[PDB]
Amino acid sequence: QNYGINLPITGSMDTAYANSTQEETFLTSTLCLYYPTEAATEINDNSWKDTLSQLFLTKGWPTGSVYFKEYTDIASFSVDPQLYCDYNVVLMKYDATLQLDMSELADLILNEWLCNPMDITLYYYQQTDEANKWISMGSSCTIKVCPLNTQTLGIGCLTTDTATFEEVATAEKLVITDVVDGVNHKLDVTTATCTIRNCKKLGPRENVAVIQVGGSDVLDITADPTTAPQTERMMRINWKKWWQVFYTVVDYVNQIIQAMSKRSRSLNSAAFYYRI
Amino acid sequence: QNYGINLPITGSMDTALTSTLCLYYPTEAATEINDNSWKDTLSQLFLTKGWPTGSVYFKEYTDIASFSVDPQLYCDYNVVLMKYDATLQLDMSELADLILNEWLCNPMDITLYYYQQTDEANKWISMGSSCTIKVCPLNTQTLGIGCLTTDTATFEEVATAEKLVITDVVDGVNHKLDVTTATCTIRNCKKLGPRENVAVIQVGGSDVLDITADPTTAPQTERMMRINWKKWWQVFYTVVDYVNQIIQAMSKRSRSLNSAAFYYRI
Amino acid sequence: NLPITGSMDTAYANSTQEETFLTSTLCLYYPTEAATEINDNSWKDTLSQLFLTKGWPTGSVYFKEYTDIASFSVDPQLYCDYNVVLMKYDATLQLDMSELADLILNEWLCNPMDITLYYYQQTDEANKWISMGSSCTIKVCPLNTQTLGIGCLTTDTATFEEVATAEKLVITDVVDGVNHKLDVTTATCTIRNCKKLGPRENVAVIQVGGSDVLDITADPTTAPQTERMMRINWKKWWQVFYTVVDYVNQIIQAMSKRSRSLNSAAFYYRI
Amino acid sequence: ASLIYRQLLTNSYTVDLSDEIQEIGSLWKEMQYNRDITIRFKFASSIVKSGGLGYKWSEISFKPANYQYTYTRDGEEVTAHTTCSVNGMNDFNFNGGSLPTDFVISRYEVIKENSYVYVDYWDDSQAFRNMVYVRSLAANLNSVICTGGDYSFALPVGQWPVMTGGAVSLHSAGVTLSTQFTDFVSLNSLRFRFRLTVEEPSFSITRTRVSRLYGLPAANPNNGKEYYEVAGRFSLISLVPSNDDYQTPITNSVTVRQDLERQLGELREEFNALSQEIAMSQLIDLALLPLDMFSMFSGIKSTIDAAKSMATSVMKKFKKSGLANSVSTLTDSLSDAASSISRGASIRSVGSSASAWTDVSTQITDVSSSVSSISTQTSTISRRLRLKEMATQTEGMNFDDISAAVLKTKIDRSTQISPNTLPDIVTEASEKFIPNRAYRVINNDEVFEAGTDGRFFAYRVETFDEIPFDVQKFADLVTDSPVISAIIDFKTLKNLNDNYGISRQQAFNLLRSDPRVLREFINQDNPIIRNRIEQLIMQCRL
Numbered sequence A: 001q002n003y004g005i006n007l008p009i010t011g012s013m014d015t016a017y018a019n020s021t022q023e024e025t026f027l028t029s030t031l032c033l034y035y036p037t038e039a040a041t042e043i044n045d046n047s048w049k050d051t052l053s054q055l056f057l058t059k060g061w062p063t064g065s066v067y068f069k070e071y072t073d074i075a076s077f078s079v080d081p082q083l084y085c086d087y088n089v090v091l092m093k094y095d096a097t098l099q100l101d102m103s104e105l106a107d108l109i110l111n112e113w114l115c116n117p118m119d120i121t122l123y124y125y126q127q128t129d130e131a132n133k134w135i136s137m138g139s140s141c142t143i144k145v146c147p148l149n150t151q152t153l154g155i156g157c158l159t160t161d162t163a164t165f166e167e168v169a170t171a172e173k174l175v176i177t178d179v180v181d182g183v184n185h186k187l188d189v190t191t192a193t194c195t196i197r198n199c200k201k202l203g204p205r206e207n208v209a210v211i212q213v214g215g216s217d218v219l220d221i222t223a224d225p226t227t228a229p230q231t232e233r234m235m236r237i238n239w240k241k242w243w244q245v246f247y248t249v250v251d252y253v254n255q256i257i258q259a260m261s262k263r264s265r266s267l268n269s270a271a272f273y274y275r276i
Numbered sequence B: 001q002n003y004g005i006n007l008p009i010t011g012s013m014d015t016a017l018t019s020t021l022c023l024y025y026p027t028e029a030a031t032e033i034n035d036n037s038w039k040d041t042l043s044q045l046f047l048t049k050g051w052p053t054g055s056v057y058f059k060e061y062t063d064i065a066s067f068s069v070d071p072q073l074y075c076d077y078n079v080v081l082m083k084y085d086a087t088l089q090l091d092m093s094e095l096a097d098l099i100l101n102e103w104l105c106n107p108m109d110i111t112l113y114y115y116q117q118t119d120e121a122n123k124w125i126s127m128g129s130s131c132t133i134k135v136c137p138l139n140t141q142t143l144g145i146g147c148l149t150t151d152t153a154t155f156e157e158v159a160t161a162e163k164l165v166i167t168d169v170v171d172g173v174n175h176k177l178d179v180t181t182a183t184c185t186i187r188n189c190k191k192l193g194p195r196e197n198v199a200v201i202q203v204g205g206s207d208v209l210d211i212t213a214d215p216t217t218a219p220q221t222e223r224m225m226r227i228n229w230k231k232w233w234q235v236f237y238t239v240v241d242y243v244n245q246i247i248q249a250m251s252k253r254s255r256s257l258n259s260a261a262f263y264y265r266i
Numbered sequence C: 001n002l003p004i005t006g007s008m009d010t011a012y013a014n015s016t017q018e019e020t021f022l023t024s025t026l027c028l029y030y031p032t033e034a035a036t037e038i039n040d041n042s043w044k045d046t047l048s049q050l051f052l053t054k055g056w057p058t059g060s061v062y063f064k065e066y067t068d069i070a071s072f073s074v075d076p077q078l079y080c081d082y083n084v085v086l087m088k089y090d091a092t093l094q095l096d097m098s099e100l101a102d103l104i105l106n107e108w109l110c111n112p113m114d115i116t117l118y119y120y121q122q123t124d125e126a127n128k129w130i131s132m133g134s135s136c137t138i139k140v141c142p143l144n145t146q147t148l149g150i151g152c153l154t155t156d157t158a159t160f161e162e163v164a165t166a167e168k169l170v171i172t173d174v175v176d177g178v179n180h181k182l183d184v185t186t187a188t189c190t191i192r193n194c195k196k197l198g199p200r201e202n203v204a205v206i207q208v209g210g211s212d213v214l215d216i217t218a219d220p221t222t223a224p225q226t227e228r229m230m231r232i233n234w235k236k237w238w239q240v241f242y243t244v245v246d247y248v249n250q251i252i253q254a255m256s257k258r259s260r261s262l263n264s265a266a267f268y269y270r271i
Numbered sequence D: 001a002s003l004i005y006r007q008l009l010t011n012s013y014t015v016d017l018s019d020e021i022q023e024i025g026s027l028w029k030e031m032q033y034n035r036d037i038t039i040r041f042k043f044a045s046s047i048v049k050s051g052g053l054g055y056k057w058s059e060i061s062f063k064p065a066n067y068q069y070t071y072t073r074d075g076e077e078v079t080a081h082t083t084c085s086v087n088g089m090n091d092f093n094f095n096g097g098s099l100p101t102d103f104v105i106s107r108y109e110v111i112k113e114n115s116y117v118y119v120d121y122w123d124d125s126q127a128f129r130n131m132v133y134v135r136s137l138a139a140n141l142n143s144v145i146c147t148g149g150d151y152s153f154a155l156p157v158g159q160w161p162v163m164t165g166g167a168v169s170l171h172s173a174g175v176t177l178s179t180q181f182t183d184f185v186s187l188n189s190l191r192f193r194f195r196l197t198v199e200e201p202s203f204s205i206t207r208t209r210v211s212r213l214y215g216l217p218a219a220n221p222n223n224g225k226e227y228y229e230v231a232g233r234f235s236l237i238s239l240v241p242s243n244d245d246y247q248t249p250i251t252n253s254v255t256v257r258q259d260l261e262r263q264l265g266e267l268r269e270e271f272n273a274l275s276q277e278i279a280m281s282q283l284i285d286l287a288l289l290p291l292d293m294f295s296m297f298s299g300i301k302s303t304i305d306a307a308k309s310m311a312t313s314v315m316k317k318f319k320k321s322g323l324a325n326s327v328s329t330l331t332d333s334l335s336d337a338a339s340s341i342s343r344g345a346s347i348r349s350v351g352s353s354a355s356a357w358t359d360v361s362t363q364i365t366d367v368s369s370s371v372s373s374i375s376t377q378t379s380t381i382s383r384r385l386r387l388k389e390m391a392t393q394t395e396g397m398n399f400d401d402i403s404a405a406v407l408k409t410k411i412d413r414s415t416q417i418s419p420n421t422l423p424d425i426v427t428e429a430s431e432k433f434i435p436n437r438a439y440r441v442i443n444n445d446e447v448f449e450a451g452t453d454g455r456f457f458a459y460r461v462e463t464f465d466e467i468p469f470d471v472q473k474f475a476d477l478v479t480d481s482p483v484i485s486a487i488i489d490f491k492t493l494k495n496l497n498d499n500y501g502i503s504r505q506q507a508f509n510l511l512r513s514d515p516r517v518l519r520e521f522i523n524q525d526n527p528i529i530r531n532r533i534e535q536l537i538m539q540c541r542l
């Protein structure tokens, strides 16, 4: 009821635990499963959605609440990834040559970002603190940056000639650019086919989990070189058959949801902080 | 917060990324200005009012109809300069209704399921290239009233080639829906309350906005301004000069994570 | 100006309406189309006799004609103690009529603006630039501390920002605290730096037809309709004048004596 | 009020800072002249070509240019003459090669934001012959745009390079007085400064690797224009000599006393005459003001040049007078005495221990009057107790306060002011004001007193009866303890006590020169204190 203020909450130890709410959340929540196209191709069964829905029902979920969203690959899925379910699970196939792209995708979807628009043609942009990044997504986003000194003259580049700009992104579907803080940069972005936004990492996004299918511990969802945390929402699975992968996902849905939580930014109690 | 949301706030009566601004203006405004550097001038004029350099943003939209197709609200404060057209009144209202309020919308699969509006806060908001909403109310036996569930030509049309439309039907009644799902999408939306971080300035005309479906009320909130105009430069100068008053009418505490005009839940 | 101590127990004095009607003058301003449609050379005397029935002595009511809103806006001289301006509504002139109201429903303290040699700025929200003439085409070039222009070159008027074209009256509001270079046609225009002091209580404006569109305040967050802004629907001008005559007591009730001590040069029609 | 003297000395260092820039640089009625002027000017170009076949230019630079015209001002056809020059120019260069063939530009001048444009302006109007004594002067002008034009280079071979582009905006920034040198007379003129701002047109040279260069080369800066015009208004306030309210000179070319005298000779008599009209209690009130530099030099109705340098001219003269050298010698003597336990023999002490305040010196000695040794010692000591006055080592109000108050109240009234009169009248006043002044030091309810005139007195505070003066104790007391100026010196104190029996508190305050008791006694019209203060004021005779 008091939505604009952060009031302290006094809890008492020894307060009896409430019964398990897993059944109630399963009955009153929606699960989205994100898988690549090759998964469906290998499975080769036009009715596999119904089979998985029935298996989830055997596991508890009502047979109208599990959604299956298909994406071509990591690169395409990274353009405006919209996750609307109460609980989102993303099966991301591992490629040894796409480590940075997978890390960027996980950073984008495993964390909450507050993004403001960017007019590279109008303003010189600066990153204030470590939580600030430049997230750009599009069909082909190429970003070059020219740092400017206190006199607004470029460093190692000329503001007039974009050829001297330092290239940081080339033909990227998604890229999270981190430059030196407290320095103004002139930006050259292929805005005609990609959008760049100035974003802050508010914190974890608890309703999105990523299962890396058949790789190693390579995701780095933090730009700090000294930290490469492996949160509970990033799992790894060895695989040969996608049917086995989906059976493992179905059978351990309890644990997968346990690793996740309702989106803190969502729901009524988050009203008037950022959203709802 | 959430664990202290349902707690009281006691106060004594005797006791005594920074903000970003977005300006949404029609393209005809920029055409009338005819200058290719007006954005920089307005940014510096705003900086006179205390907005840092890279804070104010100018977003262009072709017209009211096109802007209504899934509008996006980007900045902390969103001042929308809407040109008035006597022939588009409802549309303007619709946009305001979708922009000055917070909505909670769920997917609608019209082909498989009938739908009803539970209460006065429930509407059906549809957006896209062109919507043609045709409605067939049913009865307790699920037979259409003045319509045939099989024959869609007897359906009652409530929207035609709408880029945005908010449909209000009789509550407690199931309706079979024919929507041009190919070219536009419909959703069951609930109005939660005001969206305090968006203000709408009507350039020219008279007070015609109606952001409430109820016929008995047409409230003009502090976030609904109106100005007479002849030159768009004067319009932008009065917007810049009185930005303090415009922000006073707004609150920065309604900027969702995403720029959408409605929360979406599956 | 001195403190005025009064008792809440004092008795109401009798109606002064008759006395003020006897000792004051009323001015009615109407468009030329009103006299055209009426089509009677004695209509002034007819209205005078009707007003006399209402109480106004013969000769106290003065009828003044203006070609149209645009023409009337060029230095509107309001003579009588009580002024009522019948302003025909035109959907295309919503700003202009509003400007006219803003000019005549408020008190303005104005001083000359010698633009060709001086750089001008607006100090506060009450400050505006009122330009009046046969054709007022004002272009503005905002400046900075280094005297350079913002999106404009002080030496090239073509780059100045256009804020008014061929205007009989225009109230210009720019960003306060910023110097601007002004280029207006001084031959057919005169621009004055003005401060609005407060309402002008002896001037009422009756909008004949339309809807409430007047905005006498530059602030976008306020569009107040004071009691001196009336609006009547119409189809015949004789009915308009009859309703003005019949409710003259109500109209004057909404008005008060000017109360301002002026320094300008304007004739008055007083008794 | 004495603080002013100290501050002048304290600030004297800035005087040197002035001289540097200066040597790098090279009654009255107020009448107003606001005139709408039109400065029409232009540049000139010096194109000196080098030897060889003509492919090389030694210089292509700016040159001051004169212009004459006539324009209408308030219905008056006014003939105007202007002279435009430039300063702070960028010497670019083009070097096609070491061969005689290659295009070479040794040095070509371009004016940029770091440059300045100076324009002398004169006309035969009234305003420009009244500007000999100027109170204030300030001109505003609309900015002008000077664009560079084409200029082809005379090569007999191949393509002809062209110098196109280049533009700068001149914005008015400052107007001063200046002089135009004609053949047989000299004209007072208004010199306007203009700051340059680079503009979009960028100048480039064809047949060269030169492009996107910004500024205004000296090649063809006029771009074919007959003149460059700025229209504006200048406000001038002129000080015309007038001795009556009904006359007003059309022109102020009058001679003043300082146009003919550099050493004020008779203004001393003017000051000594001004001394008559000085009030007493109000003079004390003014003397208690901590008269700082701003307070002292703010009220003088100066000219435009005089106010610009009043403080530093006064201070330049101040750090040469006998007062400044006495302060310097005192400081050096103290530093030397502290700097070496070697020459306590050279200095002879009239106290228990050696101190620079307590040393006997030349004293050529006066056999004219039978003089006691104690008198000479006390006079020599008091002549340094004056530097104690001007070293913040005093307790009560000092004679320097009275001197400063008299100086202020006289300079404001004196109609004789000029950039050379206020110097040498502040300094010489500080030197010659109250020459014979006494000091007293209190210790254990006993007062010792000395005077520069050689009169010494020891007495008791409770009752003013003289005591055998104990030299070698007055010296030890005066070297360290607070020294009190004797405004109401012993003789006056005893007269007052005998005739006007004063209380213990009143005597206490009078001894320590408390301003309150002084002013209260003055307000009672007490003849003795009024007489003493009259003697003090008449001693401020310059």
Ligand SMILES: *[C@@H]1O[C@H](CO)[C@@H](O)[C@H](O)[C@H]1NC(C)=O
Residues within 6 Å of the ligand: A019
């Ligand atoms: C919780 O579980 C216990 C034991 O299964 C049961 O008795 C109780 O009714 C359940 N519900 C609540 C609200 O305690």
Ligand SMILES: *[C@@H]1O[C@H](CO)[C@@H](O)[C@H](O)[C@H]1NC(C)=O
Residues within 6 Å of the ligand: C014
């Ligand atoms: C006021 O009106 C009353 C009632 O009509 C009348 O008796 C009285 O004489 C009038 N005049 C004054 C001065 O009260």
Ligand SMILES: *[C@@H]1O[C@H](CO)[C@@H](O)[C@H](O)[C@H]1NC(C)=O
Residues within 6 Å of the ligand: D275, D276, D277, D534, D538
């Ligand atoms: C004369 O001068 C004395 C001191 O020099 C002063 O006290 C006096 O007021 C002056 N004038 C008259 C008229 O006494």
Ligand SMILES: [Ca+2]
Residues within 6 Å of the ligand: A100, A101, A104, A172, A173, A174, A175
């Ligand atoms: Ca990438």
Ligand SMILES: [Ca+2]
Residues within 6 Å of the ligand: A156, A157, A164, A165, A166
């Ligand atoms: Ca580079």
Ligand SMILES: [Ca+2]
Residues within 6 Å of the ligand: A127, A129, A130, A132, A178, A179, A180, A181
């Ligand atoms: Ca950074």
Ligand SMILES: [Ca+2]
Residues within 6 Å of the ligand: A220, A221, A222, A223, A224, A225, A226, A227, A228
């Ligand atoms: Ca890391």
Ligand SMILES: [Ca+2]
Residues within 6 Å of the ligand: B090, B091, B094, B162, B163, B164, B165
């Ligand atoms: Ca619509």
Ligand SMILES: [Ca+2]
Residues within 6 Å of the ligand: B146, B147, B153, B154, B155, B156
């Ligand atoms: Ca039907």
Ligand SMILES: [Ca+2]
Residues within 6 Å of the ligand: B117, B119, B120, B122, B168, B169, B170, B171
């Ligand atoms: Ca309804």
Ligand SMILES: [Ca+2]
Residues within 6 Å of the ligand: B210, B211, B212, B213, B214, B215, B216, B217, B218
């Ligand atoms: Ca309504």
Ligand SMILES: [Ca+2]
Residues within 6 Å of the ligand: C095, C096, C099, C167, C168, C169, C170
């Ligand atoms: Ca107008």
Ligand SMILES: [Ca+2]
Residues within 6 Å of the ligand: B035, C151, C152, C158, C159, C160, C161
């Ligand atoms: Ca422009």
Ligand SMILES: [Ca+2]
Residues within 6 Å of the ligand: B241, C122, C124, C125, C127, C173, C174, C175, C176
């Ligand atoms: Ca303003």
Ligand SMILES: [Ca+2]
Residues within 6 Å of the ligand: B226, B227, C215, C216, C217, C218, C219, C220, C221, C222, C223
């Ligand atoms: Ca308004």
